[model samples]
Target chain A: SHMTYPTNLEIIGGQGGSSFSFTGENNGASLEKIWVWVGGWQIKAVRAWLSDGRDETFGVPSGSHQEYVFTPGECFTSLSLWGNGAGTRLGAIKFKTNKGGEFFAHMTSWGLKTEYPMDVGSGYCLGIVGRGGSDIDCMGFMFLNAVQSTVLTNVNYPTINQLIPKVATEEIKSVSFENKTSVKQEQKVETSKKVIKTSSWSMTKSFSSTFSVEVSAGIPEIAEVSTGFSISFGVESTHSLEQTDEKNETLTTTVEVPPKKKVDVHITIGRASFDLPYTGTVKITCKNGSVLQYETKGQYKGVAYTDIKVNTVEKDL
Target chain B: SHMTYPTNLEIIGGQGGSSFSFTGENNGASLEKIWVWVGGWQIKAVRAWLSDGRDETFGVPSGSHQEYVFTPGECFTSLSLWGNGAGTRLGAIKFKTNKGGEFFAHMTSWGLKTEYPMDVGSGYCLGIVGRGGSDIDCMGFMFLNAVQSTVLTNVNYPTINQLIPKVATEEIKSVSFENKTSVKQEQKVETSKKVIKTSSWSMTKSFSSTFSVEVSAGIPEIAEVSTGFSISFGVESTHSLEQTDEKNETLTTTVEVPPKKKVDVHITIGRASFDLPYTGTVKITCKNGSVLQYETKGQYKGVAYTDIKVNTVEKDL
Candidate 1:
């Protein structure tokens, strides 16, 4: 029964050591595949499983991305993840269940110095890591706190925690900004007929969307939600011992689904403001393998305009 | 997962001889076991199975009672029943499924000299059967006309096509009445501790009930249906390396279930409007197989009271 269809994931991030977890509803959701993208760090290994015995894991290079496939028919209460090491992580992970739907979770980082906020404009751009503190060309002040006493003063610069603040216009000019926001769902309606003469003319819509997103600090997040109905109809017949008859009619059925729609957006700010146009494409294929796509490349003509091109394609059963 | 629970069954009784058939839901339910009791007639031979598959049958003496166990986990649809012959018969059959539930069906009888309603009290003490018409002393007249008149006028007893109504009271007195009821569900609850300290006082309860009813032409049926809550509680203490603290509190939790309670009732009617008193016993067993029973024989202190004795015993797990 469709009643067992998973509504949404109960996300539990920031788990043991350096891992996050995903817990699905008691509904027997078939977790087919998963893709995890580590932010700033490389993934050594990735794994996922359910309480109902579906298990899968794989090892990957220090690259920022990895994907794992779950065994079939595994119903579970909770799904756990392990990142292998500190800094070995992911910004978000997406799942493609065999049930023909998509779900995702955002990995929250804690007690870490480099996070989404700092990723905006390469904060204090010296990007150097050492003992007392970080050294950045943007904030080029070397603190010799161990050998020298405190108070190393700078002209017209002041800040707390013994750190000096500089306008650093040159660093700001070098700090180019980039942003990304996902088009969570992209839906398009289609019409088709299962049969002609003795069958009703049914309208079938194909669904397809991709899980793609990118973001920076100080940029408005992108999201979408909409609703509609699905109509369908067909013909049926009964036969006695020696006779046969067939009839046809056009009938309709409606299917309204929640959690459908997509949004992709990102922005950046600093000594300079910039609209990091969203890049990449999302391909959503509804059940029966239906596919719909939205591509943004020379897209997002400007921060104010959506420069995306759409395409629809039929699927082979 | 649970969606495959058996749906409505397609029942076929009185097939071939006195066998029955069990049809499962389209999703294929596993027929674990079956028990059948022939009604009105004696058992000669009986068999049952699915569409052209796992066939099972057995021959029993004219013991008037029989039981058949199904092959474990045999999945199928459209179960078939065979009586082995035309006179082989049954009135009802019960079934047990792999899902741990019982199902039953009543075979509707046709072209019979008598049925359950008349089968009681030996309506005509002479428990006899014949072809053209009954020759019993209770109903004496018969349609012996070959090419003749509709009415033969058996004395002042005017009869047409022919059936004679006689005051068969004497046979009613000779008929003995008996009734039995059971609580089919005997539940047991288990406890598991997820936390160690200050959390060992949870409460739980188990429940179950049965469906049973009997009605004489003049006596009311015996049945039981009531709503109540189950109560339970417990206490526990733990000692750690640092210190020890033992605290306890009485608590109450509501455990309401659909199946519970037991009942036993019986009554006699007609020539003597008497409460013949119920005879038999009801045994309820918990998870550990512990039983609580109520037995009554030659009981029922009139229509206003219950005359059964009760006993409770626990069994070791």
Candidate 2:
């Protein structure tokens, strides 16, 4: 088979101390090549011994497929692989022989499913242990040219208690992914830059009061409410606002402002004092170079007083 | 040629029956092997019928390169293949004859572009049909021993009313990508993780009131001009804020407050009613055992009201 694919080929690594080993046919045959695939969200470490008992340590980067080839004279009798940490899932493995023979082995640690011709467990082997009955942690195969085939054993593994517990916690407040492709430009390769120009005016009002304290007087309950207070200088309660100018040559008018680039107002009367409405010129400018000028003139008149009864004052006299 | 790439190879799948079929030369000779590349955005499926009219179905997973070989003596004559579903973009296809002949084909679905040598529809039969003026949907090729060749014909197929009016739309509210890599404490089995802590406060202020009204009185449009309202206790009108107390005494003030931390003294005015200028102290503690406090005193005295002019009301009374 030139390019063969394995089905449901995932091995889950058990907690600490979990391991699985594969025994080669030891048929005096040298293995030529082996392919390993790691899928399903985990990277694992593999330790194997060559036919000569020479040890080889493999660091499998998660989500990567690697091919290992031995020189013509090199071969292996048996290999042992253990899932280093918890939550490790191994996908597939392939073995090729030197005599141009081929053998396919499917991991039955989880389920017995095979697409090619091979003994399900006819040769020397030790399956997964110390974990769930379904954790297919590792497997190694030997080549046999007798029958050529493509194997696909799709099976789901049973669940086991995670030793360390998978924490579903996110620590990053935010992440930004930016793709910067350098485009061919001038002597200085440049793509583009966006500069957002913004200007804002925060209007603040302040009150200063100097009061005299009165004593020895019958306190009066003061009550007052008069047309309370109101002011508008080209600023609306919502998006748009209007202010009446000092005069009305423009028919005490109605104005319309355009889109995004909209009206900019200054309160003109940016500051105000007590019991008085500040009068100033409010100019509203729309994005289209159009300017609407309005003069705001208003007065604040509210009652503030202490109702004093004459009885206490007369008694003191 | 090795590693030949095709251009403009996008096949828009019509509704359900939307599929394009690629065929090979019906010459008396048979094909040895075929190499096909399905690239660009999607992984399409292929169902092929060999020379002897034997059916072979292939599932080409997205982003995978697969090689197809013929069974021992079996060869392919007039082979036909169609994309399984839609979004199938077959980039390039190469065919080898039993006599070691090579034929290559490119898709001109989007543009009339090619990389290597391919006959632009001179010999073999069949051309694209169905939609668009230049939509050459399909083509067939022949293999020659020495001067190998493939064919592509540009044609305008009479349109068939699209069953589903090609609905191409994409909507995304939000998407997030997170990477969590844990680190090791000791030994060969080592990794890493990151942690960050942050705190913030965003504050805004508004006023509230409830009252009744009186009938009429001769109120001299009482316009008493006084300074308006103002407030600032550490927190400014800008992005940053300030707090007092538990300082660097480090500031050597009348400094009085124990660390870890303690410090009392309200506006000692522990609390106050609004509009009444309720002044108190605001204390903020941060990680790393540090504390900051502020004496906040402010009043809300701005109101926008409606003026009800009672002209003839008292007259009627």
Question: lDDT score, residue B271, model 2?
Answer: 12
Q: For model 2, what is the alpha-carbon lDDT of residue A285?
A: 24
> For model 2, how does the per-residue alpha-carbon lDDT over A23-103 read when each residue is reduced to its tens digit?
222212222344443434222344444443434334443434455655432222222223323333333333332223333
Off by over 4 Å in 2: A1-26, A43-64, A75-84, A87-136, A140-317, B1-317
Listed in order, each prediction's TM-score against the native is 0.15, 0.11
Residue-pair clash count for candidate 2: 27
Evaluate residue A189 in candidate 1 and report its C-alpha lDDT on the 0 to 100 scale.
17
Candidate 2 CA-lDDT value: 0.23
Q: How accurate is candidate 1 locally (lDDT)?
A: 0.21
RMSD of each: 35.4, 43.4
Full-model lDDT for every candidate: 0.21, 0.23
